[PDB]
Amino acid sequence: PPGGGEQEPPPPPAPQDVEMKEEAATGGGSTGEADGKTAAAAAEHSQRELDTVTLEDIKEHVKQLEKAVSGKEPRFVLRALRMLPSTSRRLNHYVLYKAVQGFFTSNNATRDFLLPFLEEPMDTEADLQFRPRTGKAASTPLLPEVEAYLQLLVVIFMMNSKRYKEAQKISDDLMQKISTQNRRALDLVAAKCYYYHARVYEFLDKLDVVRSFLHARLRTATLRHDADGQATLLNLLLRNYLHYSLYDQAEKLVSKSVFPEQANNNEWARYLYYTGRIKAIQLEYSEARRTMTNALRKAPQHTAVGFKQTVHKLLIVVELLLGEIPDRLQFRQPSLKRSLMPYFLLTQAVRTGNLAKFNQVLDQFGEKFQADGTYTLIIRLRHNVIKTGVRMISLSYSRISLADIAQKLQLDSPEDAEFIVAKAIRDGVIEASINHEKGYVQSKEMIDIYSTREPQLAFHQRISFCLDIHNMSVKAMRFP
Amino acid sequence: PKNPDLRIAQLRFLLSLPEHRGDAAVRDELMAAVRDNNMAPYYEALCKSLDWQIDVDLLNKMKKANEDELKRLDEELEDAEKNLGESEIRDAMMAKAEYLCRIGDKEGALTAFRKTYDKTVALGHRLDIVFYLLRIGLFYMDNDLITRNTEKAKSLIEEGGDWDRRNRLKVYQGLYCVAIRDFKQAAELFLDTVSTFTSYELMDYKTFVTYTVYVSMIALERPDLREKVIKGAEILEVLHSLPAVRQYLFSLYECRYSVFFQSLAVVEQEMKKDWLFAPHYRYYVREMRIHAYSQLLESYRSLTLGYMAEAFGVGVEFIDQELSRFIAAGRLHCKIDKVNEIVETNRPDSKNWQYQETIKKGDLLLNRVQKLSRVINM
Amino acid sequence: QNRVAEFHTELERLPAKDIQTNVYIKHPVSLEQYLMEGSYNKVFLAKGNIPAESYTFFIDILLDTIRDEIAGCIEKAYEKILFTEATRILFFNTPKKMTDYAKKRGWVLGPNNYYSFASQQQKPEDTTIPSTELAKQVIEYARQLEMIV
Amino acid sequence: DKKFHGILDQGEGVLIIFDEPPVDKTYEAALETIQNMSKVVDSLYNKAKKLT
């Protein structure tokens, strides 16, 4: 109270006021946009959505006593909002419940009164007109309820709030859908509770009823129009099944649904991450890394968040299985410090022709290799180490014999050197030929590529792609 | 006060980092320690070399009573004599500050610098302080404050000076040598050697010649290189004074490769006796070797190693494995054969090489306009 | 059945039974390792070492899927090799297999010398012949340059 | 020293005289424009970064 109690009066009043005004003028701005000119594609819906993910998750994590976030439920309990006198009477109430909670205290939350704060604000003459107002006021309790992390009769209050939200979600999507379409926010709101619906089960058990319902929402969506609902719902079905260390790879293979067509530059970044994992595990490496790159290079506007850490951690692994490897520690991070050392020690022993240091590093760093989430390195690297030597020699020597390459590759067998190169030519490591007469192994002959119909075909890729960059960028801008 | 101070920086460096080299560096710097009143910046050189020795309190009371005699002077000056700007107060303040650079540590100097910098309205005084920042910033190799004061000097001081800046031409390249910029900026502004007197502004001149000759063989292959290093005169005489360096140049130019290794081995072994040779002794060697192979493999499409076995040096399997590392490094666009014994090269005939460049840069820009395209349009 | 993609994607269910113990999974994953290294000898030396019964119908197909790939690798621009090269590329000292390959395919033994036909290409390209598709590409450019304003 | 246009063989002791393409000015002037185009895309990049 002398030190800590004096800095108790400053935090409520103005953040109580200025956070309340911004969501009011947006919700009033969304309502007029819902009533007239539903073309709200470049409207304030997404930027308010980008506020709630960022600010309201870092501004507050507790239910904010002195009635700051805890006062939102006794404020919004008496809300009807049907007619023009009825709205003006409620606008009289909006002023009065802020003025009372600003001056004095009204109704306090003691981390247990979650059922009175969710059923009576849902009730009391509430209508199905102001749909984002209702969906926001149910989604905003879900954040401090999880961020409290007390786990004392809390899961059921999470669960009932989700089911009520889903009941309000189905009541929107089926009855009176005439020009409201709140799917642009409801997808993430569904995604946020499902992250909590996964995590709460992940504290205790698996999750499968969440996915059967997620099929059912995917069954009741995807017939209307793809409006970035199906995109995120495809990922939420996909993330758990990859997280399960059993199967469901073939379910994603037959999943003929790759057409989200837009992602707000948010989903397609991480959508291209997951399908890169699956093309990598299905031994299709060339298409994997080029879209693993396309995911990483898309959105670097992130200050050490972790998926950027994870795509970069995998991309260097699929590069090592191909054979080439550029620098990776050039953008060092305080989070990269515990991840830059094992892979750099890994790519050191791979590119060199050593084995005992390689096994020592493999024995030392296997605990991290399991904690990262790839196990196939144990089988796919011993092909790489034995082919790194033959690729470097075939790149260097134009014509090396088998008896020399057998002694150079510490092999002690001059009989399988024909078999290694025959595996190397078949697998596409290098284009050579074995003259099986005394052991002549030749290489390429011609270097002319220029007047031999190479350049035009790449050039036809450059023209057709950039005019498509052009015309899409033409249509995307002349909106007025 | 900061005149014999680059030599000290070598003797600190020569004694500290190699431990086998500890015989004479402790002999001459200990004489430099007990002289010059160097009483702040020697604790590490005493903690990293020897245990201790009592001459310490003797010099502490002398530097203190001198500083106090210097402290009582400029306070009486500013209490009796009222002149500001650049006055008798001012050259008292820099004489304190130069006493701080010679005797004390950097921290009291830099706060006396920023104090006396705001008491400057001329440009030569402001040039002098930035001369002092850069001189001590090289002494403690600080790559932080050099990023500021140089930009402060070139933009705000050097618009009125005239040929006072060849010294700060030389200090820039000196940072570029201890940095990685040892390629084309380093040799370009080392090309004018029109100062030989050695001063506060100019270091040892023979060593300046050896630096500007060692770096002028990486910038440029032979684009009439010989006009600037052989047809020059003032560079030519001082390398005519030095038989080792002059032998190294003619071996590279006239293609005497046999002695070239012997000259290169002498240099790299001598390179260890330096204070700024750190990004050199793993880089300068292999860059010259790959430059020596570049001009030798030029003009021979079907060269054999049987000519390399006596005209170039000795050995066969050593040259083979070194070429096999260098091709697999990614450079030296050639191919080697073992059983025909023909190092058959593949040089692009100036149309592939134009095409190889245009296909990289177009892909790098198409990536750059893709990545820009996805940031925009939501 | 030559499903290497299905091979690895199955290997996700076992946490720590692959390295620690359980030869019944350790024996196929060591076998896949030996196909990726390049030691055909280590395959058939390990064919006579089975933990449970013999795995006979598995190694018979494993013999079957190797020897045709070996036969598919050799039917190339090679012309003739003696019996000793087919004693090094293939195996056993005069089995019915060389008679099996003689009746099915060629590899006909004559005067101690086989004969393999050349299976290369001989296509005499001219490549100014696909000049219509090039003019098609030039026109569709200026189509896409114009025609939408 | 570029006073002569040819190549040598050590394996065969064979002097071979060849020639060069004189034309290079089309692609050289082309690749410099790529550098100009690269910086303006960088200059639109940080502009679109700073303000949407």
């Binding site: - | - | - | 424009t33 185009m37 639109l44 679109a48 303000l51």
Partner: peptide, 30 residues
């Protein structure tokens, strides 16, 4: 390289200006 680069970046610069001009009137109409 004249079509695919020079015509492309102009359309991108035309995209930047109108979307800024679209959002400036949209934030200042009311």
């Amino acid at each position: 390289y004249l079509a695919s680069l020079i015509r492309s970046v102009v359309a991108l610069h035309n995209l930047i200006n109108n979307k800024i001009a679209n959002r400036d009137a949209e934030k200042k109409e009311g």
